[PDB]
Amino acid sequence: EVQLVESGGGLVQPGGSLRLSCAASGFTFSSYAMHWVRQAPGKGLEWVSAIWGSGSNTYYADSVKGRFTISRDNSKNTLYLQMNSLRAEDTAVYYCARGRDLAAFTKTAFDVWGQGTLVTVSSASTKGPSVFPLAPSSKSTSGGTAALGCLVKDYFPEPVTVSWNSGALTSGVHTFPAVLQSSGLYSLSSVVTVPSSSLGTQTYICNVNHKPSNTKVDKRVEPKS
Amino acid sequence: SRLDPPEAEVQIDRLITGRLQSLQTYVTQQLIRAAEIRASANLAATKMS
Amino acid sequence: ATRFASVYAWNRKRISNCVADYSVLYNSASFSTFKCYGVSPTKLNDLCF
C-alpha cells in the first residue's frame, strides 16, 4: 500500500526556515517523481516544486523560485523541502504527491496525494484556549427548540474535538469551522440544538478537547432569571 | 521480391560471386577426377588389348 | 498517436492478424526520414510477415 506520511510542519516567524519531510513506503521510492503542492487557507491549489529523481532536475513554481529548495533521500526513502525567506503569503498546507511521468505517459497525474502538513508563517506564539458558554434567552417563545453552545476562544494551533456529557448526550451536536480574528488568534464555536423544555431539568455540559495542549473543559449552562 | 534493384544488385552480386566460385571448384575437381578416370580407361583399354 | 514513450523506455505495439497497407503511409511525404533496412520501402505490399 502506498503511504506518504508527511511531517515537519509547524510555526515559523516570517523570514525563518523550516524543513518538511515526506516518508514513503509500499513502493519503489527511487523510481518515481515527487512533487510539493500547497494550498492557502480557503483558497485554491498552487503548485510548489518537483524533483524527478535527479538531484539537479528540480523545478519550482514562479511564486517560490529562489526561496524554496527541494531534496530527496535514498536508504530510508524520504522527501524533504527546504523553505527560506518566508512571507505572510506563504502560509499554506503543503502536500507531497507522487508521479510516474518518467516512463508512464498515462498516470501523469498525482497518483496518491499525501495527507499534508500545516505551516503557518506568523510571529504569534502558541497559546491555550479560553472557553465561554453561549447562554439563551429564558423568555424565548419563538419555538420549542432553544440553541445552546460553547465558545472556544484564542487557541493556537489546530485541531479541536467536541463531546457532550461524556457521550451520554450526543443528539444535535454541531461543530463549526474555526475563524481568524483581527487580534491574530483563532476562534471557534460549537453549538447544540435541543428541546427548550429540558433547559431547567437536564444538565447540559459541553466537553472541549485540544490535542496540542491536552486541555479538557466542562461547563454547565443555566437559563438566566 | 523484397529489395529494389539499386540495393538488390549488391546482394545478388555477392550471391553470384559465391555460387560462381563454388561452381568453379566443382568443375576443377571434376576435371581432375575426369583425368584420373581417363587414365584408368586408357589402362583398361591397354589391358583389354 | 498523441503521446509516444520516452526513448529509455520506448513503446512496443504488437501488430498481427491484419492487413497492412504501406503504400498510403509511404505516399505521404509528411515524414522527415524514412530509411528501410532489410526490405525496400516499395513493393512491401506484396509481402507477408
Judge if A3-121 and A130-221 fold alike in CATH terms. yes
Q: Do A103 and C4 touch (CB under 8 A)?
A: no
For domain A130-221, say whether CATH 2.60.120.460 is its number.
no
Question: Interface of chain A against chain C, CB under 8 Å?
Answer: 102-103, 105-106
H/E/C letters for each residue in A155-205? EECCCCEEEEHHHCCCCCEEECCCEECCCCCEEEEEEEEEEHHHCCCCCCE
Query: Number of B:C CB contacts under 8 A?
Result: 16
Question: Which grid cell sits at A54?
Answer: 535527479
Three-state DSSP class for residue A6? strand
d(C-alpha A88, C-alpha A69), whole Å: 18
Task: For the domain covering A3-121, report its CATH number.
Answer: 2.60.40.10
Method in brief: cryo-EM
Edge-to-edge strands, sheet with A68-72 = A3-7, A18-25, A78-83, A68-72
Which residue of C22, C34, C39, C47 to mutate against B (max B Cβ within 10 Å)? C39
Q: Structural domain boundaries of chain A?
A: 3-121, 130-221
Resolution of the model in angstroms: 3.2
CB contacts under 8 A, C 4-33 vs B, are none
Contacts of C45 (CB under 8 A, 6+ apart): C21, C22, C23
- Which of A106, A109, A104, A96 has its CA nearest to residue A70? A96
- Which of A100, A90, A136 has its CA nearest to residue A2? A100
Q: Do C47 and B2 touch (CB under 8 A)?
A: yes
d(C-alpha A22, C-alpha A116), whole Å: 9
| B36 phi-psi bin (left φ>0, alpha ψ -120 to 50, beta other) | alpha
CB A59 within 8 A of CB A40: no
In the 8-state DSSP scheme, what is residue A127? B
